[PDB]
Amino acid sequence: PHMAALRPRLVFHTQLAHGSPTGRIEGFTNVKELYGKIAEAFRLPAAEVMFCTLNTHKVDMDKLLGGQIGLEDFIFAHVKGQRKEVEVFKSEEALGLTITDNGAGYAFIKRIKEGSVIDHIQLISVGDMIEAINGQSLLGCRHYEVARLLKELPRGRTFTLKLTEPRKALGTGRGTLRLRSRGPATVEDLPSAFEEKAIEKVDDLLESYMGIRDTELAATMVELGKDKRNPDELAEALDERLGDFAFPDEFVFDVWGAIGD
Amino acid sequence: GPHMAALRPRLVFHTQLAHGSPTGRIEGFTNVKELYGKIAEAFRLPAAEVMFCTLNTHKVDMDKLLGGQIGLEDFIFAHVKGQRKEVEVFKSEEALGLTITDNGAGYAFIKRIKEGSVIDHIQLISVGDMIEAINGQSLLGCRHYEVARLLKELPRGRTFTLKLTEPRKAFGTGRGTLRLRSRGPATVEDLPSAFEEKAIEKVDDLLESYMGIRDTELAATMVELGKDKRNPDELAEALDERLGDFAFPDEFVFDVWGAIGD
């Protein structure tokens, strides 16, 4: 699934910073339309909206809207698939299994240690839920109960597992709505730790050089310059939209170093 | 109002079956059982068909397995035009000490003021104030860098007047999350701090070494049970109340106590 196909509507909640009940808004592709929607929700002229802060009603510039509005977690449900029954020979006291459960009566395999006797059996995977051990049914049992039975299996013998596989077709992967200054909004991944730091550096340069801050613009420049391979490619790119800023080439060089490894 | 309890009337989440489905919308669950039921309902399945949930990936990724938390979207607070001010200032040789931003739609406003600056020593000017005019000339529709430049280039020694509008004011990121407790209520909370996430991971490690299991939600529960506890005995007492069915050894309880500290 491509991220933008997941939600038909991106609905957000909003309040006036000085105090109001919550309104719900949706259907905007830039900040002007965002402001429009909020004003509409509260029976205000659109001209009255100054700026937005995220997750605080205080005038907190650290939390000023700056090109990103985060989304809620998307929930993927794994349902029952192929049922298996696998015979395993306990040849080591430790089989290599870490058991969890779904907090509702199903226990399943969360970790398989590489090298372990379990790892050497190909027919068992992470995610497989354990339905029975040696014919003893385990639906309704907690992970620790299942874990215990596993530990106490006779170390000289072959045991059987009844398993159900779920059907199958860094960061957390949580989505964000990226409000771009130079075009329509997009759904993106969250910026990496590296990118956030590079964004702060560029925002610092915007201040020291131009007497401004703009996290959205900073992010735009970071995204823009990443597959540029020299300050000249970068400078060409800055000029493609941002001529009026009249970036001194020292700024370009500075930005160029700011967005690197 | 901005009280955590008064933010959202309902918490709606989107869901797909991990092997491929259209998107469904669910609401109303107060535990995992009820969550699995609402998901099964949405896709017309028996509730017993749902095995487990992963967050933000369809893959069997245990790092992203549901573990007691379902994060919410950002809450948007709109600041609107309030009190109007006119402020006269002498332009000197030195920089005013002002950092300008804008709302990306034609309003420039003050994001920072340097301590000790010309501007800082004029308490009539505040962070958040938008600049509507300089010397009567409207700046509505100007960009931040243009306002910054005008302020920079103001003739030395001459007074200038700022027409300003304050936003109306009330008398981590702060983004919310739904905490799905196994031994308590489902509530909207703040995100765990970096310390708490690390403590949780450390407790999860202990669950594996002592019991051969992992259970991130149970780890979160233990970390939350122990946060306000003065000593291991107090921890051991809370664990017995909420988690007495587990029957934890005392060395585990002591080891957990260490997990949740510096």
Author numbering:
A (entry chain B): 49 to 217, 236 to 327
B (entry chain A): 48 to 218, 237 to 327
Please give me the paper's original passages concerning this structure.
GIPC1 (GAIP interacting protein, C-terminus 1) and its two paralogs GIPC2 and GIPC3 are universal adaptor proteins that bind and regulate vesicular trafficking of many transmembrane proteins. GIPCs contribute to the endocytosis process by tethering the cargo proteins on endocytic vesicles to the motor protein myosin VI. GIPCs contain a central PDZ (PSD-95, Dlg and ZO-1) domain that mediates the interaction with the C-terminal PDZ-binding motif (PBM) in cargo proteins. The transmembrane receptor PlexinD1 contains a C-terminal ‘SEA’ motif that constitutes a PBM and interacts with GIPC1.
We crystallized the GH1-PDZ-GH2 domains of mouse GIPC1 and determined its X-ray crystal structure to 1.9 Å resolution. The GH1 domain adopts an ubiquitin-like fold composed of four β-strands and one α-helix, although it lacks obvious sequence similarity to ubiquitin. A prominent feature of the GIPC1 structure is that two molecules in the asymmetric unit form a domain-swapped dimer. The domain swap is the result of an exchange of the last β-strand between the two GH1 domains. Due to the domain swap, the PDZ domain from one molecule is located in close proximity to the GH1 domain of the dimer partner. The overall shape of the dimeric GH1-PDZ module resembles a canoe with the two GH1 domains at the middle and the two PDZ domains curving upwards at each end. The GH2 domain wedges itself between the PDZ-GH2 linker and the PDZ domain, reminiscent of a passenger sitting in the canoe formed by the dimeric GH1-PDZ modules. Notably, the loop between helices α1 and α2 in the GH2 domain partially occupies the PBM-binding groove in the PDZ domain. Conversely, the PDZ domain blocks one face on the GH2 domain that binds myosin VI (as defined by the structures of the GH2/myosin VI complexes below). Therefore, the apo-GIPC1 structure represents the state in which the PDZ and GH2 domains mutually inhibit each other.
